């Protein structure tokens, strides 16, 4: 499972950089995840693990990894052939619960991604709506 370990290295190396994360570093992470597509389940698992465990300033970067991988895979393998979005959708509620533990000023950056996902049909709207509701309810509490 060499391909996964290279992805794991790229993903974890986010900790060596102060957010905002560069286009270039995001690309490296994404290139690594695509190269590991035989183990896409393990990639999704590592990403979900990073998001659960990382410092608060890294939650939005973790979300950008999901966005970046999903979009690249749809571009590279076809919208309807993409394995990553359907796989990420399985634990997405749990994932966003962890993402919303980000700094106050970072909540809006998560909604921006959700709005883009909805606009560009990246995830099914039925998947996206409760995630948006979650962000809204956070502002009333």
């Amino acid at each position: 499972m060499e391909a996964v370990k290279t992805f794991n290295s790229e993903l974890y190396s986010l900790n060596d950089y102060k957010p905002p994360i560069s286009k270039a570093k995001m690309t490296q992470i994404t290139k690594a995840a695509i190269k590991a597509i035989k183990f896409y389940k393990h990639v999704v698992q590592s990403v979900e693990k990073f998001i659960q465990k990382c410092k608060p300033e890294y939650k939005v970067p973790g979300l950008y990894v999901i966005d970046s991988i999903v979009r690249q895979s749809r571009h590279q393998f076809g919208q309807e052939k993409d394995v990553f979005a359907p796989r990420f959708s399985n634990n997405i509620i749990s994932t966003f619960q962890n993402l919303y533990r980000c700094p106050g000023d970072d909540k809006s950056k998560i909604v921006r991604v959700l709005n883009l996902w909805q606009k560009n049909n990246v995830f099914k709207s039925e998947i996206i709506q409760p995630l948006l509701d979650m962000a809204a309810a956070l502002e009333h509490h």
Binding site: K23, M26, R74, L116
Partner: peptide, 9 residues
């Protein structure tokens, strides 16, 4: 990174 930035070729 920008979530509107075109995917790499």
């Amino acid at each position: 990174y920008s979530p509107t930035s075109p995917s790499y070729s």
